[PDB]
Amino acid sequence: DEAGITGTWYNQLGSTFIVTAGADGALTGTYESAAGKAESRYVLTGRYDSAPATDGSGTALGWTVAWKNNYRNAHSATTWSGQYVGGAEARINTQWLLTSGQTEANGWRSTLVGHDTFTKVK
Amino acid sequence: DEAGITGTWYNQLGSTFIVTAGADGALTGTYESAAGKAESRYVLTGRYDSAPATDGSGTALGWTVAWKNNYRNAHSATTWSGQYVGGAEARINTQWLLTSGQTEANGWRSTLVGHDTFTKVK
Amino acid sequence: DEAGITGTWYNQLGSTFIVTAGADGALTGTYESAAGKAESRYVLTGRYDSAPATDGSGTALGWTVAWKNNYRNAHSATTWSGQYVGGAEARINTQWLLTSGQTEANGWRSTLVGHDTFTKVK
Amino acid sequence: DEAGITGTWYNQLGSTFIVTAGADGALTGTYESAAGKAESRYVLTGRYDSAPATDGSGTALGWTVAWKNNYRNAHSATTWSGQYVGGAEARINTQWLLTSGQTEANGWRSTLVGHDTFTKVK
Numbered sequence: 001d002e003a004g005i006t007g008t009w010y011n012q013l014g015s016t017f018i019v020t021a022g023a024d025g026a027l028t029g030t031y032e033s034a035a036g037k038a039e040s041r042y043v044l045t046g047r048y049d050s051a052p053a054t055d056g057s058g059t060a061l062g063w064t065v066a067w068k069n070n071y072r073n074a075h076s077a078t079t080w081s082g083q084y085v086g087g088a089e090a091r092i093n094t095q096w097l098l099t100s101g102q103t104e105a106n107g108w109r110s111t112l113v114g115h116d117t118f119t120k121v122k
Numbered sequence: 123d124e125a126g127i128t129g130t131w132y133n134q135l136g137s138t139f140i141v142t143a144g145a146d147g148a149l150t151g152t153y154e155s156a157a158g159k160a161e162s163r164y165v166l167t168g169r170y171d172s173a174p175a176t177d178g179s180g181t182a183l184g185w186t187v188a189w190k191n192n193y194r195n196a197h198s199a200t201t202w203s204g205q206y207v208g209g210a211e212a213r214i215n216t217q218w219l220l221t222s223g224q225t226e227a228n229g230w231r232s233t234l235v236g237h238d239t240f241t242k243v244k
Numbered sequence: 245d246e247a248g249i250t251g252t253w254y255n256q257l258g259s260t261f262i263v264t265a266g267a268d269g270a271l272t273g274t275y276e277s278a279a280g281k282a283e284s285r286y287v288l289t290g291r292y293d294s295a296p297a298t299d300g301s302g303t304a305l306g307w308t309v310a311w312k313n314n315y316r317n318a319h320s321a322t323t324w325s326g327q328y329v330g331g332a333e334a335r336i337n338t339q340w341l342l343t344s345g346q347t348e349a350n351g352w353r354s355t356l357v358g359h360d361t362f363t364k365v366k
Numbered sequence: 367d368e369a370g371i372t373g374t375w376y377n378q379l380g381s382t383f384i385v386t387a388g389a390d391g392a393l394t395g396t397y398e399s400a401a402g403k404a405e406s407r408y409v410l411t412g413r414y415d416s417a418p419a420t421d422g423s424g425t426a427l428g429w430t431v432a433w434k435n436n437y438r439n440a441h442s443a444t445t446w447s448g449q450y451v452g453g454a455e456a457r458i459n460t461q462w463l464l465t466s467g468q469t470e471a472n473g474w475r476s477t478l479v480g481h482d483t484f485t486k487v488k
Contacts, residue, residue: 004134013125015128015476016146021160022141025165025190026165026167026187027186029169029203035474036474036475038171041207042145043148043169044169045148045149045167045169045186046167046168046186046199046201046208047165047166047174047186047187047188048187048188048199049165049189049190049197049198049223050188050190051190051195051197052223053196053197053223055225056225056226057197057223057224057225058180058223058224058225058226058229058232059127059224060197060198060199060221060222061186061188061199061200061221062186062188062199062200062219063186063201064149064168064169064183064184064185064186064201064203065169065171065172066147066169066172066183067182067186068171068172068216073171073173075171075175075179075181075182076171077168077169077170077171077182077184078184078203079168079184079185079186079202079203081186081199081200081201081218081219081220081221081233082221082223082233083223083224083229083232085226089137093232094221095221095233095235095358095359096203096217096219097184097201097203097217097218097219097238097374097479098184098203098206099182099184099203099204099216099217100182101132101171101174101175101179101180101181101182101204101205102179102180103177103179104178104180104207104304105180105182107136107180107205108401108402108478108480109402109478110180110205110215110480111204111217111478111479111480112474112475112477112478113217113235113339113357113463113477113478113479113480114339114359114474114476115339115358115359119206120150121171121488135352136363141293157352158352158353166482182296217479217481219478221359228424230257230279230295230356230358231280231356233353233356233357233358234352234353234356235353235356235357235461235479236352236354237461237480237481238354253435263391266448266461267407268384269412269432269434270384271411271430275457280398281432287391287392287412287413288413288431289392289393289412289413290411290412290427290430290443291409291410291411291431291432291443292432292443292478293432293433293434293439293441293442293443293467294420294432294434296441296467297433297467298488300469300470301441301467301468301469302467302468302469302470302476303467304433304441304442304465304466304467304475305430305432305443305465306430306432306442306443306445306463307430308393308411308412308413308427308428308430308442308447308467309384309413310391310413310414310416310426310427310428311426312391312414312415312416312417315419315477317415317425319414319418319419319423320415320426321412321414321415321426321427321428321429321447322447323428323429323430323445323446323463324445325377325430325443325444325445325462325463325464325465325477326465326477327468327473327476329469329470333438333472336409337391337476338465338478339463339465339477340447340463341445341447341461341462341463342447343426343427343428343447343448343449343460344426345418345419345425345426346423346424347421347422347423347424348422348424348443348451350370351449351459352375354424354449354459355447355461356447357461357479364470
């Protein structure tokens with residue numbers, strides 16, 4: 001599934017995730033968000049299970065983007081946790097957490113949760 | 123906060139997170155879980171906001187561990203999203219998502235959510 | 245939106261949510277899950293914002309089901325948090341948390357997170 | 367555990383949750399938040415597993431508050447999912463989701479996640 005994961009993915013928001021999966025579990029790449037306080041591409045890094053089971057289960061993975069690049073600093077970071085499912089309609093199904101830098105008093109309002117689905121077309 | 127983040131952290135479960143923060147936002151390191159289907163150390167990678175605001179807000183960050191190393195393969199990955207708060211009781215406050223590889227039919231039961239707090243002592 | 249919310253909704257799993265919205269914010273009804281350790285109907289109760297803004301924003305709401313009825317006891321409860329959006333393709337968009345009764349030591353593995361979308365057809 | 371749950375609970379934010387647990391799984395009561403856009407008391411309703419297992423596992427429960435009362439309308443609702451653990455340091459351990467009414471375009475930024483722990487003292 002190194003082969004399966006590596007490439008360009010798109011989510012339902014129009015965001016673009018470009019990733020290379022390394023042989024021993026690394027994910028590296030760039031993320032471009034169609035939504036929020038984001039412009040251009042941001043570095044991403046993450047991990048995947050390089051030896052998934054072969055019972056039709058997906059391949060567990062995750063990655064993080066900190067929302068800082070040369071154009072913008074959104075004082076926040078998102079992590080996506082999910083799985084890759086291969087085949088003719090290959091998908092990466094995720095849930096994510098977006099934490100923004102807040103005072104310790106405003107900690108309760110720091111973290112958004114949502115869900116993105118990534119496909120190889122759009 | 124490169125300085126502040128780099129080092130060894132412990133959570134309320136007894137887990138140990140060793141991390142180096144790089145100058146332009148990288149987090150690399152190892153994670154050893156006191157809980158779950160985990161043995162020894164696992165690679166982690168993530169990102170942090172290398173230029174946080176200076177109003178007392180924390181520093182947004184996240185990282186991922188895929189639960190595969192030479193000893194075990196738990197067909198799963200966790201991502202932690204949170205923030206570093208510095209000072210005499212420095213903390214990394216997080217929420218996490220743990221996704222396990224599942225059939226597409228069992229997707230609804232794939233992802234656990236929780237929260238860990240990391241400190242420099244314990 | 246009392247009118248809009250009251251009725252029968254279906255999610256992407258084939259589950260059926262029957263609800264009455266009361267004038268001062270109550271939600272009462274029954275839930276029948278197509279997934280998991282569930283049979284027949286279960287009581288639900290919840291709340292909604294009975295005076296939403298009129299800028300095209302949805303109507304905030306939530307409800308809980310404890311997974312006990314005469315046929316089954318799954319020692320667990322789900323809560324759905326989300327919003328009702330009206331019109332020709334009316335939707336209730338939700339995120340949910342499912343907590344299962346666990347020992348205090350297994351607390352970290354107690355809570356699943358996911359997302360359901362409800363429609364008036366299927 | 368009807369007995370155990372019924373009463374007044376306090377969380378780490380100073381919020382106060384007053385609840386009655388009914389014999390067949392109902393939770394009714396009032397919630398007063400020390401945090402956020404909240405004043406005075408708000409209705410809550412929820413459910414609990416009225417027949418938990420007796421292996422030391424907690425009692426699964428959840429409830430919802432819509433943030434509207436005579437004083438304020440915050441166009442939002444929170445749901446808490448968690449468990450009651452009895453004994454000399456009785457606790458209700460929760461994760462919560464707070465959804466705010468948003469346009470369908472801003473749906474991705476609608477829902478906060480966090481965690482509250484409730485105790486019988488403070």
